[PDB]
Design a protein around this ligand. Structure first.
Ligand SMILES: [Mg+2]
Ligand SMILES: [Mg+2]
Ligand SMILES: [Mg+2]
Ligand SMILES: [Mg+2]
Ligand SMILES: [Mg+2]
Ligand SMILES: [Mg+2]
Ligand SMILES: [Mg+2]
Ligand SMILES: [Mg+2]
Ligand SMILES: [Mg+2]
Ligand SMILES: [Mg+2]
Ligand SMILES: [Mg+2]
Ligand SMILES: [Mg+2]
Ligand SMILES: [Mg+2]
Ligand SMILES: [Mg+2]
Ligand SMILES: [Mg+2]
Ligand SMILES: [Mg+2]
Ligand SMILES: [Mg+2]
Ligand SMILES: [Mg+2]
Ligand SMILES: [Mg+2]
Ligand SMILES: [Mg+2]
Ligand SMILES: [Mg+2]
Ligand SMILES: [Mg+2]
Ligand SMILES: [Mg+2]
Ligand SMILES: [Mg+2]
Ligand SMILES: [Mg+2]
Ligand SMILES: [Mg+2]
Ligand SMILES: [Zn+2]
Lengths: 81, 138, 169, 133
RNA sequence: UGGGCAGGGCGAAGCCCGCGGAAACGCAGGUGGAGGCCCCGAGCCGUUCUGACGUGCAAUUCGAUGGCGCGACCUGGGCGUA
RNA sequence: GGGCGCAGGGCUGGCGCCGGGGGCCCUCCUCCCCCGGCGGCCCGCCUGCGGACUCUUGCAGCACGAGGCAGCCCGCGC
RNA sequence: CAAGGAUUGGCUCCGGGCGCCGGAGCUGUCGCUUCCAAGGGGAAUCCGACUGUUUAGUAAAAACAUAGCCUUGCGCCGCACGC
RNA sequence: UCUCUUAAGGUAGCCAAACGCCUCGUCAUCUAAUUAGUGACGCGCAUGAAUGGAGCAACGAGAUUCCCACUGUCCCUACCUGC
RNA sequence: ACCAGGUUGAUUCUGCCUGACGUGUGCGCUAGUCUUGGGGACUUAGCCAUGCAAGCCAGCGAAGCGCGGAGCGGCGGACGGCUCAGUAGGACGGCGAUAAUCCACCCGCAGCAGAGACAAGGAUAACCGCGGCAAGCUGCGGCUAAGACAUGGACAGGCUGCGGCGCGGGGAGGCGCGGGCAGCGGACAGGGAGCGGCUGCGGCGGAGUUGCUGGCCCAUCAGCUGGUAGGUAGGGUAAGGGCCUACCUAGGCGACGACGGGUGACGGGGGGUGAGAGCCCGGAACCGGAGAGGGAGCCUGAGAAACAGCUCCCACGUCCAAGGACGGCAGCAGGCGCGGAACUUGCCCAAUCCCGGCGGGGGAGGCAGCCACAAGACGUCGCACGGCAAAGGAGU
RNA sequence: AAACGUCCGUAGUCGGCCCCGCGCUGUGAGGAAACCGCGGGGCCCAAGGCGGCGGGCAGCACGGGAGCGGGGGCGACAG
RNA sequence: CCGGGGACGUGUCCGUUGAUCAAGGACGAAGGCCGGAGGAUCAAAGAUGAUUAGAUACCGUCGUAGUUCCGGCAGUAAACGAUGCCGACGGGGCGAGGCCAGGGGGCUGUGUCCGGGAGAAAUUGGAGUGUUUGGGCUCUGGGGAUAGUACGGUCGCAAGACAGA
RNA sequence: GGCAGGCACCCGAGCCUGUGCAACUAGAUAAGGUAUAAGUCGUAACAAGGCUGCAGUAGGUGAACCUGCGGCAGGAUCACUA
């Protein structure tokens, strides 16, 4: 009962918008909707609330991050210093 | 596959090897059925359509007196070579002639190219009877 | 007619079999003689080898025994109370083998009270069987095959065999 | 439960339970002698006889309660290659309830040719040997 | 700043279990209920009949047919743009 | 903020039983019409004891404290 | 809903996981989504990708919009992933 | 291969196309018969690459042809009802 | 147990081609004798004119003139013969099973109802007439037989349910038999040529199911399966079984190749060819299977899903007076068609055997003819004899 | 003409040393004639006829000193 | 910094756990493709200046993709040692590896030279221990051409790849 | 209406429709392959084949082929702070 063989989360878009556009937005819609590990409580409960704001729903730890990921490459590099 | 219990593997493997053997390849494919001219049955008999000018393969320079023949059992139009010097004038149009192979396993014999069959009888009497005058064409 | 062969069946591996030869009389089957209650009508068939097989079409009574005391009567069949394979066969009152049927109690209660006159302890041993007898309920199973023998013989239900079946209907 | 009242054969000649000896130099299991199961297809307490080939195979599948799949592995000799072939056939074998729990997957089981018990069942388990033994 | 918009259909991720697998994973059954998805109700609109009407019911309406119908919608009020 | 669903739900209907009030009936029919705050518990959060389990229709939860027990709180509900 | 096929009423039961589901039997002038409600379908071509928008009152379209793609200007801006 | 000439000489594609005057082009298919449709052909009056070319999955009250089924569209009308 | 020719200017190789040998199919040319065998398998399991191919009898015995032979009755026609389409396991072969089954001839045994019994009842065909109808076929009336069909009469066998000890057999049992209670049911009313009926047990002769196992190719066929795998219960069958049905389990098979496809595939005993391992072939004598233009259904019978039986459909074909009636040569000859490719519309039951209770029948079968198709032996015209079913040939 | 670019990898196939069952094998049963092998046999010879003797089967029965399992002990210029 | 690796050394442990592979999986130069970043050199395409009989080329200049990095695709090479993996045995010499030992030493890599054997020969420590033919396992070839082409399949965004008449 | 006919079940040909599989065939057009008498255009390879060659990949050209990148020697080098 997989349902789809290749499209996965962008099966909601049906046949529309073109294969490459559905292929491009698939990595981002996996990214923006996923739960992430809170670095303040440890649990995989960080969800996006709005673009740029990521909040852990367990311990209410909210932090400003990337648009569709909690971390960007430019944002990671400034913090690793 | 040389162990004592490898017989079913060896039969499976060597049969797949044997499919690359060209003599076994024709029996496996059934090419003698794909061309019903001379393979499955000898002595194809058919109706002559026209006399054909065909030149020998060089260095030999001559003109073999072939004829197109449409078979009765198939309707296939195959070309056939007339032996026995001067026999091409003894065969005429709309004759019913019998054709034989060349003893070359389905290939051309000597200087002739492409022609895989040859006539032996015209109107159910042989060309050896006509080349020497033994019999008469009806 | 109906056949007995497996030439239409699939194989053990599920492969379909090719059906080529014409049907033989070696493996021929027949209709189910759905034997019902009524005045006795048996059908005679010259079956294989000339032997006459009698199947019962309608069938009124059955030679029923009481296994505890070794006496029998041909009491009339009233209705099929339970059939094991299908309850369709008891709704139509179809007499086959192993069909629990309601018998005529009159002929059996005459000898049962007669032995109860001598031995008073007999009624107490299985109270449930003698409970239904005074109500007039007497049940038996067909042990013969009426489509093969043409008869509906069997035995009276008694004991735990009876309480097994009265829970089933 | 059961569609008919559970009943056994009348024992000719524990004298209240019917059980027969199948012959061929075999023994009745004590689970068959001292048991309450009413399997009619059982070789010991039922209506089948053992006649014909008796082979020994290994249990392949114990699914589907009363039947089991018994694989008999044998060698066939290819005369051209002068080697053997590992072959096998699977048999749907009737497993009597007297062997319930005793026979498990892997045990070497001797099966005897019965009647055509089912469509694909012509053998019944008459004895067994555990894999660990 | 308020309000309005049947009922069905399809069944995306995720999840559960079974089966298969050395592994990666793959099938299958449920679950879940996504989408400017599908048929459609109130309603809205205006495809066709080139229907009715055409000094009309009407200075654009009526009927059938059709499309839309949780939206890139519709709507009351306030406000802005002359 | 919007939305499918789960649960609750101002209320509404049906059935059964009972109860008034009114009208109709060749036969049949019990026909037709109308009317009938307060305390405890339950949720769920939290607390105490205690220490590891535990759901949900659904993702899951849980040592940053599970289930359980005893409380507490505030609503829905009885 | 590709195409395409079968079935569908009433009654009396039986079974189940029981607002429903499955099965059987009986039955009618063969008839059952019985009124109502409620897709005609297939093979192709042209154009526009799509949902959407439009000439209130002769054009709803292939036009417009769209996302995408691209180019331009801008570090005095709402601050370049911007306008 | 030679030669004239341009800023460059139409490339990949595609086509009597909604773009072809001739023209009802030619060939094939579709038909009893087709200025239609489709598939080809291309010295294309005057196709052609974000003035976007090619491309049709999905979608369409868009434009077109064929087939099945259907029918008062017609042969060829008739009767009935309301107003 | 063999190589030879062919790539080069020459060489050594690899490599294939070709020669050289057997076999069988066809063609060609040629041909003196004899014996023996084979011969429309391949394409067309294509189509068929005409004749023939399975009939026989002892019961009863009509016409016809005691003879007689009709019809009834019975037995066979399910065997042989032909063919190889289908068939990849429903086959075949090997080894089993039938304790899961049935049965004709024949053989060996036991038996066959006292019933008014020194005795058996109604029919029908033949036949006698009268007809219908182109033909094929059929009606009406009248009588009349039985080893036909009944009646009469039950000691047993048998069937079913229940009960149930033993004695025998068997590897294994309520298998056989004895002992029980019920419900059924059920074997001679024949004859003055030998007998013939019927019931049972045991064979024999068959037959149905069935287990294990072996046997072609394709993976450019990798997953298959829903009555599918199992259980319970009933049905049905001669008989076990998903054989079928009812309800219920979720099974069953597969790279140890399932499943699907292909096959110009009947299988085998075998044949060919090679020193051998192998490779190839098996239409073809014998055995088994299957079929009778394609099908399906059935009657009778012990045995057929029969085909020189029936019923129908389909495809071909024929006759008709137009209402109807017929045909199935993969039997034997023979014709056409097909193709490369295959014989006389001969004689006969004499031999080999079969059916029938004997005198009969047998295109099974033999004899001859045709054919260089094959094996073997041998050269370069007319009497008598001889044999033969008859003729011819061999042999003097 | 032809070692898959590499590595992993399951079925498959193959696999260290020491210390009743099964494989393998011998004989025998039972297995049609034709055929085939052999052997006779003056059909005028021959092919033959006819008569002897044999073979066939990873089925069955009996036998078999070795081989393999089972279980311990080594710890392989095996891992 | 994190991770890995083989060889050696060892009275360390386990004790046959192994070898090879259909299927399957992972990695896989260059060029290519997708999205993002970047762009010095070089440079397909393109543009020129020449050469030339012609020159769409070689030469000069310029120049885009690309070359670069990150995430992925792709999955090919003369991916060669044109030499599969594992294992037993087999002559000397010289070298510049690593570890050990201290006794022109042992293990393990690595080249080389000369012989043996092999081979049609070139050659070759395996291409040896092969008609005195048998260690295991996998793959491939079967005259040339058609052709690594077509069809069907699977994979891929595509290019195409695999497989394959 | 008991040799008719009827009803239900069962076996079921045959036909029709839809579809799977297997195998065959027509076709405008258009692409290959092979053989032609060898004609035209060249000369890519074989010598450092006159730009070393080859295969891969990408693009391009009337055409062999050319060019870029990385390989390879089957090279025209077994050879130099030894
Ligand atoms: Mg919508
Ligand atoms: Mg709509
Ligand atoms: Mg509008
Ligand atoms: Mg708690
Ligand atoms: Mg439909
Ligand atoms: Mg469609
Ligand atoms: Mg649009
Ligand atoms: Mg308008
Ligand atoms: Mg675009
Ligand atoms: Mg152009
Ligand atoms: Mg036209
Ligand atoms: Mg038209
Ligand atoms: Mg441009
Ligand atoms: Mg334009
Ligand atoms: Mg729209
Ligand atoms: Mg008469
Ligand atoms: Mg009369
Ligand atoms: Mg065949
Ligand atoms: Mg044969
Ligand atoms: Mg090579
Ligand atoms: Mg790369
Ligand atoms: Mg790159
Ligand atoms: Mg890029
Ligand atoms: Mg430059
Ligand atoms: Mg392809
Ligand atoms: Mg060069
Ligand atoms: Zn947190």
């Amino acid at each position: 009962s997989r349902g789809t063989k290749k499209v996965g989360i962008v099966g909601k878009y049906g046949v529309r918008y073109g294969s490459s556009l559905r292929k491009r937005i698939k990595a981002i819609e996996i990214s923006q909707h996923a739960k992430y590990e809170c670095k303040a409580c440890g649990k995989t409960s960080v969800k996006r609330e709005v673009v740029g704001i990521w909040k852990c729903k367990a311990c209410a730890f909210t932090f400003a991050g990337g648009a569709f990921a909690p971390t960007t490459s430019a944002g990671a590099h400034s913090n690793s210093i | 596959m040389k162990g004592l219990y490898c017989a079913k593997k060896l039969k499976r493997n060597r049969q797949a090897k044997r499919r690359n053997d060209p003599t076994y390849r024709k029996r496996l494919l059934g090419t003698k059925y794909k061309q019903d001219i001379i393979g499955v049955a000898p002595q194809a008999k058919g109706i002559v359509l026209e006399k054909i000018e065909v030149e020998a393969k060089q260095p030999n320079s001559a003109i073999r007196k072939a004829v197109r023949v449409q078979l009765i059992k198939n309707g296939k139009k195959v070309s056939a070579f007339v032996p026995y010097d001067g026999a091409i004038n003894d065969i005429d149009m709309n004759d019913i002639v019998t054709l034989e192979g060349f003893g070359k396993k389905g290939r051309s014999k000597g200087d002739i190219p492409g022609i895989r069959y040859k006539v032996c009888k015209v109107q159910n009497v042989s060309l050896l009877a006509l080349f020497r005058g033994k019999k008469d064409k009806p | 007619g109906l056949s007995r062969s497996n030439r239409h069946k699939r194989t053990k591996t599920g492969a379909k079999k090719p059906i080529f030869c014409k049907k033989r009389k070696f493996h021929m089957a027949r209709q189910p003689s759905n034997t019902k209650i009524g005045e006795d009508k048996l059908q005679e068939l010259r079956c294989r080898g000339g032997v006459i097989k009698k199947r019962a079409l309608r069938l009124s009574s059955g030679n029923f025994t009481c296994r505890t005391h070794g006496f029998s009567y041909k009491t009339k069949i009233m209705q099929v109370m339970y059939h094991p394979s299908s309850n369709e066969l008891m709704r139509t009152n179809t007499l086959t083998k192993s069909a629990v049927i309601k018998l005529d109690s009159k002929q059996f209660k005459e000898k049962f009270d007669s032995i109860l006159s001598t031995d008073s302890e007999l009624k107490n041993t299985d109270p449930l069987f003698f409970s239904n007898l005074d109500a007039g309920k007497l049940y038996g199973v067909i042990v013969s095959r009426p489509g093969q023998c043409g008869r509906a013989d069997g035995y009276i239900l008694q004991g735990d065999e009876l309480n097994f079946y009265i829970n089933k209907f | 439960k059961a569609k008919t009242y559970p009943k056994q054969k009348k024992p000719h000649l524990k004298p209240e339970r019917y059980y027969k000896n199948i012959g061929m130099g075999y023994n009745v299991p004590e689970t068959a002698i001292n048991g309450t199961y009413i399997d009619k297809k059982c070789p010991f307490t039922g209506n089948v006889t053992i006649r014909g080939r008796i082979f020994k195979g290994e249990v392949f599948k114990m699914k589907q309660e009363k039947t089991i799949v018994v694989v008999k592995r044998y060698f066939h000799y290819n005369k051209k290659y002068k080697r053997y072939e590992r072959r096998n056939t699977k048999f749907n074998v009737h497993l009597s309830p007297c062997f319930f729990g005793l026979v498990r997957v892997g045990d070497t089981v001797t099966c005897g040719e019965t009647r055509a018990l089912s469509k694909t069942k012509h053998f019944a388990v008459i004895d067994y040997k555990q894999k660990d033994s």
